[PDB]
Amino acid sequence: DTVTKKGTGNFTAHGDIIHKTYKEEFPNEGTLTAFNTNFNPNTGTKGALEYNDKIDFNKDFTITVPVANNNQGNTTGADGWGFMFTQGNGQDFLNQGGILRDKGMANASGFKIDTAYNNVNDADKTNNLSQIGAAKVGYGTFVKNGADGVTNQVGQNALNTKDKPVNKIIYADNTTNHLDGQFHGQRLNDVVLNYDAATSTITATYAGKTWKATTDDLGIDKSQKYNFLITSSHMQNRYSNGIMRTNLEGVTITTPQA
Ligand SMILES: [Ca+2]
Numbered sequence: 001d002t003v004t005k006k007g008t009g010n011f012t013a014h015g016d017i018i019h020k021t022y023k024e025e026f027p028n029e030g031t032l033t034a035f036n037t038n039f040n041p042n043t044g045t046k047g048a049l050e051y052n053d054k055i056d057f058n059k060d061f062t063i064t065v066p067v068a069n070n071n072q073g074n075t076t077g078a079d080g081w082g083f084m085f086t087q088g089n090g091q092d093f094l095n096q097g098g099i100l101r102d103k104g105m106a107n108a109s110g111f112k113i114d115t116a117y118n119n120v121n122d123a124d125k126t127n128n129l130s131q132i133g134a135a136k137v138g139y140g141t142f143v144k145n146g147a148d149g150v151t152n153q154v155g156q157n158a159l160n161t162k163d164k165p166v167n168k169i170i171y172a173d174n175t176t177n178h179l180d181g182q183f184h185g186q187r188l189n190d191v192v193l194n195y196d197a198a199t200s201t202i203t204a205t206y207a208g209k210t211w212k213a214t215t216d217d218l219g220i221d222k223s224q225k226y227n228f229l230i231t232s233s234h235m236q237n238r239y240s241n242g243i244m245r246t247n248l249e250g251v252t253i254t255t256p257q258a
Contacts, residue, residue, distance in 0.1 A: 007251030014090030015047040035232035046233035050090040054225035066250035078242035080115035082231035109144035109218035139167035142213035155213025
């Protein structure tokens with residue numbers, strides 16, 4: 001027996017979050033939740049949706065987040081998506097930062113869809129990223145912030161892909177054929193974080209690619225309850241819209257009942 005809560009009213013907003021419909025671009029969707037709309041190239045912008053219930057890493061879970069990326073090159077667009085687990089909260093994230101850059105909240109960890117060429121970790125041509133500038137190309141990976149806040153790449157590269165680089169994600173294209181069957185990252189697509197307590201492993205699925213990390217890789221203490229944040233950010237000194245969207249009705253947190 002499992003239970004599923006959906007986003008809708010089970011998330012609290014922190015920082016640069018608005019909820020509105022996009023009837024021209026997403027006519028089948030209802031109210032979408034948008035990060036980074038509050039343009040300011042002085043400061044950049046960030047936001048986090050904090051799940052109102054705790055995550056228990058002694059029990060299985062599956063978290064599904066529909067995301068739609070900015071149709072924007074990796075030097076001008078948003079940093080990406082940080083699916084963070086932390087004993088800290090959204091307020092801390094606004095004050096200390098997240099998992100999408102080189103430094104954020106101490107001990108925060110989780111899965112990132114990195115959609116920006118901005119940091120030394122982005123520099124890894126073998127594993128992560130070799131197309132820079134106009135390319136709507138990024139990469140996925142688990143990351144852990146250390147005790148010092150520094151973000152490290154952890155866990156496995158993508159399983160059984162032939163892509164080069166192995167962690168590559170083409171996070172957007174200009175397609176008008178949204179229901180091609182091909183992956184179109186600017187449309188809504190599920191990120192699935194499956195956690196198997198028996199193997200202490202989170203599997204992340206996005207764009208038909210799979211990553212895994214253990215709780216040990218993420219520095220997660222299974223005895224402690226964690227908060228779950230969906231985060232995005234857009235750098236200072238980026239003159240673009242870096243708008244990153246989710247459908248909070250499509251956000252599902254499934255756990256065993258006990
Ligand atoms: Ca990056």
